[PDB]
Design an enzyme around this catalytic site. Structure first.
Site, PDB file in Angstrom:
ATOM      1  N   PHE A  89     -12.497   1.326  21.937  1.00  0.00           N
ATOM      2  CA  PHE A  89     -12.256   2.760  22.044  1.00  0.00           C
ATOM      3  C   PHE A  89     -11.304   3.263  20.965  1.00  0.00           C
ATOM      4  O   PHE A  89     -10.692   4.323  21.127  1.00  0.00           O
ATOM      5  CB  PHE A  89     -11.710   3.108  23.428  1.00  0.00           C
ATOM      6  CG  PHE A  89     -12.663   2.813  24.549  1.00  0.00           C
ATOM      7  CD1 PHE A  89     -13.628   3.735  24.917  1.00  0.00           C
ATOM      8  CD2 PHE A  89     -12.587   1.616  25.242  1.00  0.00           C
ATOM      9  CE1 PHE A  89     -14.503   3.467  25.952  1.00  0.00           C
ATOM     10  CE2 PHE A  89     -13.461   1.342  26.277  1.00  0.00           C
ATOM     11  CZ  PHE A  89     -14.421   2.269  26.632  1.00  0.00           C
ATOM     12  N   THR A 146     -24.146   6.642  24.355  1.00  0.00           N
ATOM     13  CA  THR A 146     -23.212   5.523  24.409  1.00  0.00           C
ATOM     14  C   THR A 146     -23.186   4.876  25.788  1.00  0.00           C
ATOM     15  O   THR A 146     -23.081   3.649  25.896  1.00  0.00           O
ATOM     16  CB  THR A 146     -21.815   5.991  24.012  1.00  0.00           C
ATOM     17  OG1 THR A 146     -21.324   6.916  24.990  1.00  0.00           O
ATOM     18  CG2 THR A 146     -21.864   6.678  22.660  1.00  0.00           C
ATOM     19  N   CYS A 159     -10.658   7.298  21.578  1.00  0.00           N
ATOM     20  CA  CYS A 159     -11.683   7.893  22.425  1.00  0.00           C
ATOM     21  C   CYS A 159     -11.030   8.690  23.549  1.00  0.00           C
ATOM     22  O   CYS A 159     -10.302   8.130  24.376  1.00  0.00           O
ATOM     23  CB  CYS A 159     -12.595   6.811  22.996  1.00  0.00           C
ATOM     24  SG  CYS A 159     -13.874   7.432  24.110  1.00  0.00           S
TER      25      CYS A 159
HETATM   26  C1  HEM Z   1     -18.706   2.915  26.295  1.00  0.00           C
HETATM   27  C2  HEM Z   1     -18.424   4.194  26.021  1.00  0.00           C
HETATM   28  C3  HEM Z   1     -17.590   4.688  24.809  1.00  0.00           C
HETATM   29  C4  HEM Z   1     -17.012   3.989  23.810  1.00  0.00           C
HETATM   30  C5  HEM Z   1     -17.005   2.462  23.571  1.00  0.00           C
HETATM   31  C6  HEM Z   1     -16.348   4.934  22.933  1.00  0.00           C
HETATM   32  C7  HEM Z   1     -15.640   4.625  21.791  1.00  0.00           C
HETATM   33  C8  HEM Z   1     -15.062   5.532  20.927  1.00  0.00           C
HETATM   34  C9  HEM Z   1     -14.389   5.219  19.684  1.00  0.00           C
HETATM   35  C10 HEM Z   1     -14.198   3.804  19.099  1.00  0.00           C
HETATM   36  C11 HEM Z   1     -13.965   6.363  19.138  1.00  0.00           C
HETATM   37  C12 HEM Z   1     -13.197   6.506  17.806  1.00  0.00           C
HETATM   38  C13 HEM Z   1     -11.728   6.159  18.034  1.00  0.00           C
HETATM   39  C14 HEM Z   1     -10.976   6.203  16.730  1.00  0.00           C
HETATM   40  O1  HEM Z   1     -11.563   6.646  15.709  1.00  0.00           O
HETATM   41  O2  HEM Z   1      -9.788   5.790  16.713  1.00  0.00           O
HETATM   42  C15 HEM Z   1     -14.354   7.451  20.013  1.00  0.00           C
HETATM   43  C16 HEM Z   1     -14.101   8.790  19.807  1.00  0.00           C
HETATM   44  C17 HEM Z   1     -14.410   9.820  20.673  1.00  0.00           C
HETATM   45  N1  HEM Z   1     -15.041   9.690  21.896  1.00  0.00           N
HETATM   46 FE1  HEM Z   1     -15.697   7.939  22.727  1.00  0.00          FE
HETATM   47  N2  HEM Z   1     -16.548   6.204  23.433  1.00  0.00           N
HETATM   48  C18 HEM Z   1     -17.304   6.091  24.581  1.00  0.00           C
HETATM   49  C19 HEM Z   1     -17.715   7.141  25.374  1.00  0.00           C
HETATM   50  C20 HEM Z   1     -17.285   8.448  25.284  1.00  0.00           C
HETATM   51  C21 HEM Z   1     -17.429   9.465  26.305  1.00  0.00           C
HETATM   52  C22 HEM Z   1     -18.091   9.269  27.687  1.00  0.00           C
HETATM   53  C23 HEM Z   1     -16.889  10.599  25.855  1.00  0.00           C
HETATM   54  C24 HEM Z   1     -16.856  11.912  26.677  1.00  0.00           C
HETATM   55  C25 HEM Z   1     -16.239  13.018  26.255  1.00  0.00           C
HETATM   56  C26 HEM Z   1     -16.378  10.350  24.514  1.00  0.00           C
HETATM   57  C27 HEM Z   1     -15.744  11.241  23.671  1.00  0.00           C
HETATM   58  C28 HEM Z   1     -15.166  10.950  22.453  1.00  0.00           C
HETATM   59  C29 HEM Z   1     -14.584  11.901  21.527  1.00  0.00           C
HETATM   60  C30 HEM Z   1     -14.503  13.430  21.736  1.00  0.00           C
HETATM   61  C31 HEM Z   1     -14.134  11.226  20.464  1.00  0.00           C
HETATM   62  C32 HEM Z   1     -13.432  11.835  19.230  1.00  0.00           C
HETATM   63  C33 HEM Z   1     -11.966  12.083  19.568  1.00  0.00           C
HETATM   64  C34 HEM Z   1     -11.279  12.777  18.422  1.00  0.00           C
HETATM   65  O3  HEM Z   1     -11.893  12.890  17.330  1.00  0.00           O
HETATM   66  O4  HEM Z   1     -10.116  13.221  18.603  1.00  0.00           O
HETATM   67  N3  HEM Z   1     -16.640   9.025  24.207  1.00  0.00           N
HETATM   68  N4  HEM Z   1     -15.019   6.904  21.095  1.00  0.00           N
HETATM   69  C1  LIG Z   2     -22.702   7.500  13.125  1.00  0.00           C
HETATM   70  C2  LIG Z   2     -22.104   8.046  11.818  1.00  0.00           C
HETATM   71  C3  LIG Z   2     -21.156   7.019  11.158  1.00  0.00           C
HETATM   72  C4  LIG Z   2     -23.265   8.338  10.827  1.00  0.00           C
HETATM   73  O1  LIG Z   2     -21.315   9.248  12.045  1.00  0.00           O
HETATM   74  C5  LIG Z   2     -20.564   9.421  13.227  1.00  0.00           C
HETATM   75  O2  LIG Z   2     -19.852   8.495  13.602  1.00  0.00           O
HETATM   76  N1  LIG Z   2     -20.628  10.613  13.979  1.00  0.00           N
HETATM   77  C6  LIG Z   2     -19.476  11.432  14.519  1.00  0.00           C
HETATM   78  C7  LIG Z   2     -19.662  12.944  14.105  1.00  0.00           C
HETATM   79  S1  LIG Z   2     -21.317  13.635  14.664  1.00  0.00           S
HETATM   80  C8  LIG Z   2     -21.591  13.674  16.542  1.00  0.00           C
HETATM   81  C9  LIG Z   2     -21.974  15.137  16.970  1.00  0.00           C
HETATM   82  C10 LIG Z   2     -23.259  15.322  17.812  1.00  0.00           C
HETATM   83  C11 LIG Z   2     -23.344  16.238  18.874  1.00  0.00           C
HETATM   84  C12 LIG Z   2     -24.516  16.389  19.630  1.00  0.00           C
HETATM   85  C13 LIG Z   2     -25.653  15.632  19.345  1.00  0.00           C
HETATM   86  C14 LIG Z   2     -25.600  14.713  18.299  1.00  0.00           C
HETATM   87  C15 LIG Z   2     -24.425  14.567  17.549  1.00  0.00           C
HETATM   88  C16 LIG Z   2     -20.293  13.200  17.246  1.00  0.00           C
HETATM   89  O3  LIG Z   2     -19.364  13.915  17.337  1.00  0.00           O
HETATM   90  N2  LIG Z   2     -20.258  11.843  17.795  1.00  0.00           N
HETATM   91  C17 LIG Z   2     -21.395  10.913  17.735  1.00  0.00           C
HETATM   92  C18 LIG Z   2     -21.061   9.367  17.926  1.00  0.00           C
HETATM   93  C19 LIG Z   2     -21.156   8.804  19.382  1.00  0.00           C
HETATM   94  C20 LIG Z   2     -19.827   8.560  20.123  1.00  0.00           C
HETATM   95  C21 LIG Z   2     -19.031   9.626  20.576  1.00  0.00           C
HETATM   96  C22 LIG Z   2     -17.825   9.374  21.249  1.00  0.00           C
HETATM   97  N3  LIG Z   2     -17.365   8.124  21.502  1.00  0.00           N
HETATM   98  C23 LIG Z   2     -18.126   7.087  21.071  1.00  0.00           C
HETATM   99  C24 LIG Z   2     -19.339   7.260  20.390  1.00  0.00           C
HETATM  100  C25 LIG Z   2     -18.040  10.892  14.149  1.00  0.00           C
HETATM  101  C26 LIG Z   2     -17.545   9.682  14.956  1.00  0.00           C
HETATM  102  C27 LIG Z   2     -16.832   8.654  14.333  1.00  0.00           C
HETATM  103  C28 LIG Z   2     -16.368   7.533  15.020  1.00  0.00           C
HETATM  104  C29 LIG Z   2     -16.610   7.397  16.386  1.00  0.00           C
HETATM  105  C30 LIG Z   2     -17.323   8.400  17.049  1.00  0.00           C
HETATM  106  C31 LIG Z   2     -17.785   9.521  16.344  1.00  0.00           C
END
Ligand code: HEM
Ligand SMILES: CC(C)(C)OC(=O)N[C@H](CS[C@H](Cc1ccccc1)C(=O)NCCCc1ccncc1)Cc1ccccc1
Ligand code: HEM
Ligand SMILES: CC(C)(C)OC(=O)N[C@H](CS[C@H](Cc1ccccc1)C(=O)NCCCc1ccncc1)Cc1ccccc1
Lengths: 448, 448
Positions: free
Chosen positions: A386, A260, A393
């Site tokens: 986010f 990302t 996020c």
């Molecule tokens: C430009 C960079 C990034 C963008 C635009 C982004 C965006 C997002 C979005 C849209 C979601 C889903 C939010 C929702 O479903 O309400 C998400 C989930 C998440 N992101 Fe990011 N993300 C970015 C980078 C990162 C980074 C650097 C991390 C480092 C740990 C991260 C960790 C996570 C995790 C763990 C979730 C799942 C949280 C949960 O399920 O409780 N993401 N992100």
């Molecule tokens: C794309 C699709 C709709 C098919 O399925 C998902 O979206 N995949 C995830 C669940 S698998 C993955 C696990 C993993 C770990 C190690 C190497 C490879 C994969 C994960 O945990 N993250 C991967 C998204 C990148 C991201 C993370 C945080 N922030 C922003 C972007 C669920 C999810 C749903 C909405 C937003 C983010 C994740």
């Protein structure tokens, strides 16, 4: 079976085919299908990922109710993902009280105080990004942004997550994935095969990397005990975290902070090259805050306002999530609309970010939408790069800080110009990930 | 995968085999396996139905916590059963708020006031049971109890559930089932095939009977509108009941009131024939309360105490459920014992009913255990023929009233003696249902 739900509820949408539903409309990507449905059907519409009903909503008050108001009660989990194996304990995969426990255990890890302590160590690889750029720039050879930014994003990760210091571009056994193959395509048509592959230990994440990171972490744990994100999770261990859960979260943080951060940086530099005025004004602001190529700090990054306008406008045009999804666990009626149990509520982030009714000239790259004057008129439930709510996020602060630190050091020393092989305009991949079709290539010139 | 859970929790149990778990120990039935595990391992033990961990408990305080105290919070649903199709809306299959809604909608249906109104109509088929018995008894031809009681149980059902009046023994297109075939045996080894057969519309209940009862009910509904259990559910329609849900509950009530009433009556008459003193004392009590073969009423049935002692003692020796099961939906610790999420908590009713530490001479048929003097010393969480808690048997009052009305009219006119072909002692089927191996055959003699 379920292909008569939206018909019964009086909700419009494309007529689904047996077994397949509306997945054949994905032949031009999730983005184009969400834009066409928003134009054809209006504020709310429904479709079927095979047999799974997906209800799409675009009302900001209704989006707030799903993501924020009724998060813990009804809309707590995303759609069931598998086969995942031991990665079920992953925070982005966990459900209900298991996620709410992991969310609380990993929330102090992503505070601004912990992020500020990472900045001086993160700022080391910004210099690595310049000297490696200096080689490929000093030679008249166009540079692929996904390779140079992908190396930097991996460098920040291995250092901020395990203390491992590697120049990944010039020097590590992390093996990659693929996220758009007949695989998931089939899993959507045949979701009944998920418990099949789970008992086979067929994991979408290939065992050998998980085994590597599992034993690599346990080597680091017993070397520091007794004599980054790993240490923040070691110090953390709601009954304390498990060893198998600890490596699983790392595996998330490895992919999240890697692909990302590399993609958005590639989307930002593509806009800066195709808009030289925005690139010059950003270089002037960076030079004004940091004269004589001063190293950026946590406080100076938050001081640059035009830099935040460039990052936010790029995330508007390229929100890498594309969609936000929640699973309705209980029969509810929100904002005067009944939602049955089991329906996946979806928020089309890409379609809402390019909605002409909320944005003037949505296809154009205009950072002035996020100026300190105009930022107040932006609905936080229409612009969701986010996400929003308790399950947004968790690495939003780290990602925004990591990307800005890279842009500052890169723009302090280099100017980026389009090439002949540069894809102008950038065409997004017709797949299921928000990524460019052809990789972004640009000409890098030194400011010296 | 999960075969190391009870090992980690320090809970004893048989060592499971890969894939199969401990299902190979079912070669002598659920009953014999529960008795051996209770003897070998003690108060608590665990085993695996394939990959599914099953935790067995025998402590009455711990049983009360699962069935009563923590029913709505944790132990709300039985183990997931499928493929069921539209019968998901069945009350004995529904889960969480869907069951708690159906339980409240069908609770006033099974009140004592509604049961008393059914008695004069139910008492009609007790006479049908005698005259049909009179034919097969007037001839020196031994009578199969499952055929004569199975016909009576179906007669009560079609009348008390739809108003249909049929002498099923002499006169109806309800087609039967089978409940112990390589089928479920395979479903236990391969539970991942349940969502497979669901999308195929492969229902464990064959469509043609459900289609019959669906259109048969809608004929009765629009014939009474405008010009039994069906009418009690029509008057009932927590948003009101659905038409597809209404027929599904009937389908439950068709099987529940049929096979279970026929089996217990066959187990009771087997004990009465092998214990002529108990049969004579029951005939003396019936004649004292109902002289001159007086027709039994709702009030006179509750007046016979020795009749209730015979029914309760038979249910102790033959509890047709055998086991009581609940699914642990949240990580909990009850009575000083941690139970992980997803573990199926099981209560071995058959093993506890024959536990020598709670019953003196448990294999013997002694109705005096349930006398008005000794009934106070019976723990309601060790003797559970109808379960316990909010999800106990909803037709307990109807079943006890239906069986006693049959026993009174039958014993008013006939005496039952063992034959040569009578299986003495009765050997229970080594399968998964509490039913006799060979059908009970007895000699019927008239009291005239
Ligand atoms: C430009 C960079 C990034 C963008 C635009 C982004 C965006 C997002 C979005 C849209 C979601 C889903 C939010 C929702 O479903 O309400 C998400 C989930 C998440 N992101 Fe990011 N993300 C970015 C980078 C990162 C980074 C650097 C991390 C480092 C740990 C991260 C960790 C996570 C995790 C763990 C979730 C799942 C949280 C949960 O399920 O409780 N993401 N992100
Ligand atoms: C794309 C699709 C709709 C098919 O399925 C998902 O979206 N995949 C995830 C669940 S698998 C993955 C696990 C993993 C770990 C190690 C190497 C490879 C994969 C994960 O945990 N993250 C991967 C998204 C990148 C991201 C993370 C945080 N922030 C922003 C972007 C669920 C999810 C749903 C909405 C937003 C983010 C994740
Ligand atoms: C001798 C006769 C019967 C016996 C011994 C018996 C016993 C039981 C037992 C032990 C249970 C499970 C309780 C638990 O899990 O806690 C049960 C459930 C049930 N029984 Fe009976 N039963 C009998 C007859 C009937 C009859 C006549 C009906 C008529 C409607 C009926 C309807 C039901 C239903 C609907 C359930 C499920 C309730 C729920 O899931 O909420 N049973 N029975
Ligand atoms: C036996 C096994 C362990 C493999 O699976 C179950 O036990 N089957 C049920 C679920 S299928 C069935 C539906 C149906 C309908 C029409 C014709 C055929 C079947 C049902 O609803 N009931 C059938 C039991 C008879 C009974 C009913 C009430 N009272 C006492 C006995 C779950 C259940 C669990 C514990 C106790 C009772 C039922």
């Amino acid at each position: 079976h379920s292909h008569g739900l939206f018909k019964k509820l009086g909700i419009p949408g494309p007529t689904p085919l047996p077994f397949l539903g509306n997945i054949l409309s994905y032949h031009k990507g999730f983005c184009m299908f969400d834009m066409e449905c928003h134009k054809k059907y209006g504020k709310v519409w429904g479709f079927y990922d095979g047999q799974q009903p997906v209800l799409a909503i675009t009302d900001p008050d209704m989006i707030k109710t799903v993501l924020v108001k009724e998060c813990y009660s009804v809309f707590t989990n995303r759609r069931p993902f598998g086969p995942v194996g031991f990665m079920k304990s992953a925070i982005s995969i966990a459900e209900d009280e298991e996620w709410k426990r992991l969310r609380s255990l990993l929330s102090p890890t992503f505070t601004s105080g912990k992020l500020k302590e990472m900045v001086p160590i993160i700022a080391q690889y910004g210099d690595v990004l310049v000297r490696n750029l200096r080689r490929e720039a000093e030679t008249g050879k166009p540079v692929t942004l996904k390779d140079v930014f992908g190396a930097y994003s991996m460098d920040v990760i291995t250092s901020t997550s395990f203390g491992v210091n590697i120049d990944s571009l010039n020097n590590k056994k992390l093996l990659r994935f693929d996220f758009l193959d007949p695989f998931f395509l089939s899993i959507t048509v045949f979701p009944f095969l998920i418990p099949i592959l789970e008992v086979l230990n067929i994991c979408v994440f290939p065992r050998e990397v998980t085994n590597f990171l599992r034993k690599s972490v346990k080597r680091m744990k017993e070397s520091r005990l007794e004599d980054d994100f790993l240490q923040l999770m070691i110090d953390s261990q709601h009954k304390a975290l498990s060893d198998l859960e600890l490596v699983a979260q790392s595996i998330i943080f490895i992919f999240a902070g890697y692909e990302t951060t590399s993609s958005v940086l590639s989307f930002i530099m593509y806009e800066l090259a195709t808009h030289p005025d925005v690139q010059q004004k950003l270089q002037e602001e960076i030079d004004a805050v940091l004269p004589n190529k001063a190293p950026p700090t946590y406080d100076t990054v938050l001081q640059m306002e035009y830099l935040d306008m460039v990052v936010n406008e790029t995330l508007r045009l390229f929100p890498i999530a594309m969609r936000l999804e929640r699973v309705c666990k209980k029969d509810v009626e929100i904002n005067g609309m009944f939602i049955p149990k089991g329906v996946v509520v979806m928020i089309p982030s890409y379609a809402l970010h390019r909605d002409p009714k909320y944005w003037t000239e949505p296809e154009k790259f205009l950072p002035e939408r996020f100026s300190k004057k105009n930022k107040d008129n932006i609905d936080p439930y229409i612009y969701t790069p986010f996400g929003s709510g308790p399950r947004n996020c968790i690495g939003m602060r780290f990602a925004l800080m990591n990307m800005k630190l890279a842009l500052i050091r890169v723009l302090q020393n280099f100017s980026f110009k389009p090439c002949k092989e540069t894809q102008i305009p950038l065409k997004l991949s017709l797949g299921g990930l928000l990524q460019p079709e052809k990789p972004v290539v640009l000409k890098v010139e030194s400011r010296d």
